[PDB]
Amino acid sequence: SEALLEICQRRHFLSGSKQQLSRDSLLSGCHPGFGPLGVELRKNLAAEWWTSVVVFREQVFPVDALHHKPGPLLPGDSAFRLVSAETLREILQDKELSKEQLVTFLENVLKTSGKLRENLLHGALEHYVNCLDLVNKRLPYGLAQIGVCFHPVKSIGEKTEASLVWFTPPRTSNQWLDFWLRHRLQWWRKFAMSPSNFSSSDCQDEEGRKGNKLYYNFPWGKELIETLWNLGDHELLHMYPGNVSKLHGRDGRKNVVPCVLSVNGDLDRGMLAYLYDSFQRKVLKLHPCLAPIKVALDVGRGPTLELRQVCQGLFNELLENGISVWPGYLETMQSSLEQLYSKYDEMSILFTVLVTETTLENGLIHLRSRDTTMKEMMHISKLKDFLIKYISSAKNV
Amino acid sequence: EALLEICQRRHFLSGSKQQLSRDSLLSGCHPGFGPLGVELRKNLAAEWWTSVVVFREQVFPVDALHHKPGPLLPGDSAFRLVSAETLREILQDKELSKEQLVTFLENVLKTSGKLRENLLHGALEHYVNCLDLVNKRLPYGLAQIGVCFHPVKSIGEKTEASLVWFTPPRTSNQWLDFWLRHRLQWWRKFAMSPSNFSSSDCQDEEGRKGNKLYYNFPWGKELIETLWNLGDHELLHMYPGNVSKLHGRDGRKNVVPCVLSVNGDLDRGMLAYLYDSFQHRKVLKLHPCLAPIKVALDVGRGPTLELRQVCQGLFNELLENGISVWPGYLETMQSSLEQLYSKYDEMSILFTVLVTETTLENGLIHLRSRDTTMKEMMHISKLKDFLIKYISSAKNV
């Protein structure tokens, strides 16, 4: 057992009670949601993911699908139907065969009501043709999407998935799959403290043949976080009946129906994975590129109005450049310093600059660290360009 | 019409010139958004964010779930997530039936979950917990940008951005006014014809008084956003009895804040702008920091694999700076400069730089334009500086 989900509550990472934030509730997507920090943490994570596949080599396009699969479905699906509430009402009236009409109706529902998306892949495929234009017709190119998906556990679970659908030709097909497992796997470790607990695996036949899975070692045993698959041309054809020559882009001097590779990661569980990976003096050593609030900062020995003057010149300063500040220079008592440092260790901050009078009578402040825990002396004017480096640095490594 | 067709051909609005119509698009009951659209809204949202959140650290990102389970107030108009594993053992089972069916359709509106209608409710369910996150100090907000499903029966997805500003009653009126002016200025800022973006007062709801913002489309004004002063109502009913747990410090005064809800329609705003930038001399003149693609660039008079390699130099140089670029340097049959100069206008690319031989031999590229339709001389090394100054300007005006 661990008291991480404790800190995570007190510091607004996870949200909800101590009963509705169950372990099985956290993983099934049935939690009550996230705290501002969890939101910010997932937000960067989402951001990083994006820069990794989509920004970089832009042959990838963000695409926008709906959250529900409308119209008539197949026999079963087991997923919940979306029934227009104000229809149920008009049924608890009418009296129209208050025994037989209200018993044949429910046969229309099951067959004519929509549902909520199980994945981001359908909406991806639904775009292929329209988007196959956008690149003359050359392959391969992807369609990236990051969004919420509803999976049943009866209760409903919500998960924020990141999805990249790669449209590559059969030849390179099984090859690209390699590339991506590598890319993905390499990506997760990039921000891990124990990259040893992020592993990969083989497997096949679930909608084609050939696929891997990325796992993360929770203090209680491996749990899935990202899956890869080479579906082939299957669903592409099944979705796009008719002229096959309406599909296929180009491998070279010859047109060919592309194979559908599919990457899918669970961001909310990837979230957790990181919050566990940074714990076991409390402290969360969340990677610099994923830390919710890059740097707090208060005021110390000296005046007051005068002292929290540059604070805002900084708060803004750091902000005009992409540095998440935590203005704590607006609370009260010195709240100690150990009671103010151990705390930010929990909030998983990165540095803790403190401005004092001995800052005005010169031009220096003193940032402490979360790791090296040193209490250095710094020239309050080379702090911006410093953070921008340290951070962008923790990136390159 | 001419804008709609373009929005189609140029990948802004996905669909058929029938499912992508006047009514569906507004009713938000359309097929989706092509890459350009998604990137346009993306910036709209990206810009929204910094304008009301990235600063004044009172506002915190909050994460509301898409469906609220548990017991729900029977009746009203929304979308009930009905179970099929519960809807099943009734039909193809004939579970007694006859005199029974009417407790299900009844018990449903109670047991059944709902897909959120707005983001407001999810926020208040965060007020109390996000209170011990600024030592009960008002005013502080809870921002959120997300999808809500409203009925048109046919579902209807709209991406809403919302700010829920909690404040002391004392200034309740003061704030509402600032937001309206704030918000309203914001829309106008990225508009060609701000004379189309209008405000207006009105009242009587779960509180009284609130403004409404509209956009002067070609066929007459349409609602795009709405500010409201719900007062303490909403927040009180939310947590009856236990009222102490709600006091927010206003100076040295303990009070129960006023929920000032702001809610704009990002999607309608994404269409609002496409029009605001339209009216064979087509060209969508989207605002700089809203255009989906800030800069095109392909090769011209000279070599290929030696004149293309350089492009990638700017491509990356640009990408590494946050400058959306269009990779034309990977196209086939020339098909003209005008056919391609007017082609980029439709996609509303800001600049169109040509990297030719007359640039490889020394170091001088040739960019064009969209607005001033100009064509000047620029060192292939002062393009990014320019670009980032062009934007870090038109943006702040």
XYZ file of C-alpha atoms in Angstrom, chain A residues 16-337:
322
model
C -13.250 13.148 -5.312
C -13.673 11.410 -1.961
C -11.565 8.581 -0.536
C -14.204 6.001 -1.522
C -15.205 7.185 -5.014
C -11.488 7.477 -5.889
C -11.201 3.688 -5.691
C -8.270 1.836 -7.234
C -10.654 -0.022 -9.541
C -12.504 3.292 -9.999
C -9.297 5.076 -11.049
C -8.493 2.474 -13.705
C -12.037 1.913 -15.010
C -12.501 5.567 -15.821
C -15.220 5.802 -13.164
C -13.473 8.345 -10.966
C -15.197 11.660 -10.292
C -12.652 13.406 -12.479
C -9.421 15.341 -12.029
C -8.203 18.336 -10.046
C -6.723 21.460 -11.756
C -3.313 19.865 -11.399
C -4.441 16.574 -12.910
C -5.966 18.567 -15.727
C -2.774 20.547 -16.264
C -0.650 17.382 -15.999
C -2.761 15.526 -18.572
C -2.793 18.712 -20.628
C 0.988 18.765 -20.997
C 1.060 15.013 -21.558
C -1.533 15.517 -24.284
C 0.628 18.354 -25.602
C 3.810 16.332 -25.619
C 2.106 13.347 -27.311
C 1.025 15.720 -29.992
C 4.398 17.245 -30.627
C 5.773 13.712 -30.846
C 3.655 12.289 -33.668
C 1.710 15.175 -35.259
C 3.836 18.345 -35.081
C 7.285 16.867 -35.909
C 6.825 15.254 -39.336
C 3.509 16.898 -40.389
C 2.120 14.257 -42.774
C -0.267 13.772 -39.865
C -3.478 15.775 -39.691
C -5.663 16.505 -36.672
C -9.164 15.390 -37.565
C -12.518 15.850 -35.819
C -15.021 13.060 -35.209
C -18.234 12.983 -33.170
C -18.746 11.501 -29.702
C -21.672 9.271 -30.669
C -22.338 6.732 -33.432
C -25.777 7.891 -34.669
C -28.382 6.049 -36.727
C -29.293 2.315 -36.767
C -26.816 -0.117 -35.170
C -26.288 -3.884 -35.536
C -28.044 -6.648 -33.487
C -26.576 -6.261 -30.007
C -23.553 -4.019 -29.412
C -24.166 -4.293 -25.646
C -23.397 -0.569 -25.408
C -25.887 1.885 -23.946
C -28.248 3.580 -26.408
C -28.783 7.359 -26.357
C -32.517 7.887 -25.878
C -33.956 11.399 -26.190
C -35.292 11.741 -22.628
C -38.206 13.897 -23.746
C -39.448 10.927 -25.774
C -39.716 8.617 -22.800
C -42.081 11.191 -21.320
C -44.391 11.336 -24.394
C -44.582 7.585 -23.917
C -45.706 7.713 -20.295
C -48.914 9.184 -21.711
C -50.804 8.698 -25.004
C -52.234 5.495 -23.480
C -51.909 4.161 -27.033
C -52.126 0.439 -26.327
C -50.943 0.964 -22.757
C -49.793 -2.675 -23.004
C -48.860 -3.518 -26.606
C -47.660 -0.295 -28.263
C -45.287 0.416 -25.364
C -43.978 -3.127 -25.819
C -43.195 -2.961 -29.556
C -41.690 0.503 -29.189
C -38.729 -0.758 -27.178
C -37.950 -2.887 -30.254
C -37.474 0.321 -32.256
C -35.124 1.790 -29.643
C -32.598 -1.115 -29.510
C -32.520 -0.999 -33.321
C -32.727 2.745 -34.023
C -30.928 4.590 -31.195
C -27.350 5.817 -31.266
C -24.417 5.095 -28.953
C -21.225 6.655 -27.587
C -17.870 5.998 -29.313
C -15.786 3.087 -28.084
C -12.755 4.414 -29.951
C -11.282 7.117 -32.176
C -10.555 4.735 -35.059
C -13.985 4.712 -36.675
C -14.100 8.495 -36.901
C -10.600 8.275 -38.307
C -11.492 5.888 -41.095
C -14.671 7.827 -41.878
C -12.271 10.599 -42.964
C -9.771 8.654 -45.110
C -11.372 9.427 -48.473
C -11.957 13.115 -47.790
C -8.429 13.342 -46.353
C -6.774 11.164 -48.991
C -7.197 14.189 -51.203
C -5.269 16.606 -48.978
C -2.009 14.773 -49.712
C -2.402 14.642 -53.506
C -2.981 10.927 -52.921
C 0.479 9.894 -51.690
C 0.835 7.519 -48.749
C 1.570 7.139 -45.921
C -0.070 9.861 -43.827
C -1.827 9.773 -40.500
C -4.917 11.229 -38.859
C -4.320 12.042 -35.181
C -7.019 12.545 -32.570
C -7.056 12.962 -28.770
C -10.379 12.554 -27.060
C -12.723 11.018 -24.552
C -14.161 7.589 -25.091
C -16.854 5.740 -23.228
C -16.195 2.147 -22.193
C -18.568 0.085 -20.004
C -17.319 -1.653 -16.850
C -23.596 -1.411 -15.009
C -21.619 1.851 -15.011
C -19.939 3.874 -17.787
C -16.297 4.815 -17.883
C -14.710 7.828 -19.494
C -11.157 7.793 -20.851
C -9.097 10.325 -22.782
C -7.462 8.433 -25.586
C -4.808 9.643 -28.028
C -5.198 8.016 -31.446
C -3.011 7.981 -34.563
C -4.222 6.060 -37.566
C -1.431 5.425 -40.066
C -2.399 4.773 -43.682
C 0.589 2.835 -45.008
C 0.984 0.411 -47.977
C 1.244 -3.396 -47.287
C 4.958 -3.481 -48.150
C 6.040 -0.951 -45.508
C 2.944 -1.883 -43.460
C 4.430 -4.461 -41.092
C 7.564 -2.311 -41.142
C 5.960 0.956 -39.946
C 4.322 -0.975 -37.139
C 7.862 -1.583 -35.918
C 8.694 2.100 -36.169
C 5.700 3.115 -34.087
C 6.092 0.561 -31.274
C 9.587 1.907 -30.991
C 8.485 5.557 -31.191
C 5.687 5.050 -28.679
C 7.636 2.890 -26.265
C 10.573 5.294 -26.483
C 8.156 8.187 -25.805
C 6.730 6.864 -22.508
C 10.171 6.191 -21.033
C 11.328 9.691 -22.062
C 9.587 11.209 -19.036
C 9.878 8.254 -16.659
C 12.139 7.964 -13.624
C 12.080 4.162 -13.799
C 11.851 3.602 -17.582
C 12.299 0.016 -16.520
C 8.603 -0.251 -15.585
C 7.319 0.573 -19.075
C 7.404 -2.580 -21.202
C 6.152 -3.857 -24.601
C 4.692 -7.107 -25.928
C 3.612 -9.152 -28.947
C 0.209 -10.664 -29.904
C -2.196 -11.085 -32.846
C -5.659 -11.597 -34.431
C -8.179 -9.093 -33.019
C -9.136 -7.302 -36.251
C -6.168 -8.445 -38.323
C -2.850 -10.105 -37.543
C 0.118 -8.486 -35.766
C 0.000 -6.147 -32.787
C 1.810 -5.013 -29.625
C 0.859 -3.592 -26.223
C 2.578 -1.109 -23.910
C 2.437 -1.798 -20.202
C 3.237 0.107 -17.028
C 4.292 -1.611 -13.775
C 1.954 -0.294 -11.097
C 3.252 -1.207 -7.603
C 0.792 -4.103 -7.912
C 1.580 -5.418 -11.408
C 1.579 -4.495 -15.112
C -1.424 -2.642 -16.529
C -2.107 -1.745 -20.168
C -1.636 1.873 -21.345
C -1.143 1.792 -25.111
C -1.977 -0.688 -27.861
C -0.763 -1.035 -31.480
C -2.337 -2.991 -34.366
C -1.966 -3.629 -38.086
C -5.579 -4.083 -39.166
C -4.671 -4.333 -42.835
C -7.102 -3.210 -45.540
C -10.010 -4.928 -43.797
C -12.140 -2.188 -42.185
C -11.109 0.243 -44.867
C -12.828 -1.860 -47.496
C -15.755 -2.832 -45.257
C -16.386 0.815 -44.477
C -15.843 1.954 -48.056
C -17.697 -0.522 -50.249
C -17.946 0.129 -53.954
C -15.131 1.431 -56.113
C -11.885 0.278 -54.513
C -10.198 2.651 -56.942
C -11.816 5.385 -54.819
C -9.576 4.437 -51.954
C -5.879 3.616 -52.398
C -3.252 6.304 -52.665
C 0.165 5.642 -54.129
C 3.187 3.601 -53.077
C 5.117 4.733 -56.130
C 4.291 4.537 -59.822
C 1.495 2.181 -58.751
C -1.703 2.816 -56.771
C -2.519 0.444 -53.903
C -5.137 0.192 -51.110
C -3.344 1.161 -47.882
C -3.140 -0.986 -44.761
C -4.558 0.568 -41.584
C -2.061 0.678 -38.732
C -3.612 1.916 -35.428
C -1.937 3.456 -32.379
C -3.995 4.004 -29.193
C -2.912 5.230 -25.769
C -4.768 5.810 -22.524
C -3.806 9.311 -21.335
C -5.686 9.209 -18.023
C -3.968 5.968 -17.046
C -0.745 7.334 -18.517
C -1.429 10.173 -16.118
C -1.537 7.838 -13.100
C 1.453 5.850 -14.345
C 3.394 9.068 -14.046
C 2.073 10.028 -10.648
C 3.067 6.617 -9.308
C 6.431 6.664 -11.067
C 7.324 9.930 -9.282
C 6.659 8.776 -5.717
C 7.564 5.622 -3.728
C 9.871 13.622 2.917
C 6.926 13.303 0.510
C 7.707 14.744 -2.946
C 6.726 14.060 -6.521
C 9.565 14.127 -9.029
C 7.359 14.535 -12.109
C 9.500 15.058 -15.216
C 10.133 18.747 -15.907
C 8.232 18.618 -19.235
C 5.198 17.153 -17.483
C 5.214 19.006 -14.204
C 1.942 20.901 -13.737
C 3.435 24.060 -12.177
C 7.048 24.766 -13.281
C 7.791 27.120 -10.368
C 6.176 28.666 -7.322
C 7.397 31.854 -5.707
C 6.646 33.828 -2.544
C 7.891 36.937 -0.768
C 10.055 37.021 2.354
C 11.957 39.206 4.819
C 11.300 42.854 3.986
C 8.339 45.190 3.254
C 5.210 43.862 1.522
C 3.478 45.848 -1.240
C 7.032 46.729 -2.277
C 8.115 43.087 -2.247
C 5.153 41.587 -4.126
C 5.880 44.207 -6.794
C 8.441 42.342 -8.891
C 6.556 39.111 -8.159
C 3.946 40.158 -10.683
C 6.658 41.438 -12.985
C 7.887 37.860 -12.830
C 4.634 35.966 -12.682
C 3.860 37.831 -15.905
C 7.509 37.619 -16.993
C 7.614 33.838 -16.763
C 4.163 33.712 -18.358
C 4.891 35.881 -21.406
C 7.101 32.887 -22.274
C 5.280 29.696 -21.318
C 6.317 29.132 -17.720
C 3.559 28.052 -15.362
C 4.020 30.090 -12.189
C 2.297 29.478 -8.897
C 1.860 32.841 -7.235
C 1.899 31.895 -3.586
C 3.054 35.434 -2.875
C -0.572 36.124 -2.039
C -1.311 33.969 1.001
C -0.252 34.970 4.520
C 2.363 34.043 7.156
C 5.777 32.769 6.076
C 4.030 29.451 6.736
C 7.503 28.384 7.887
C 9.673 27.355 4.942
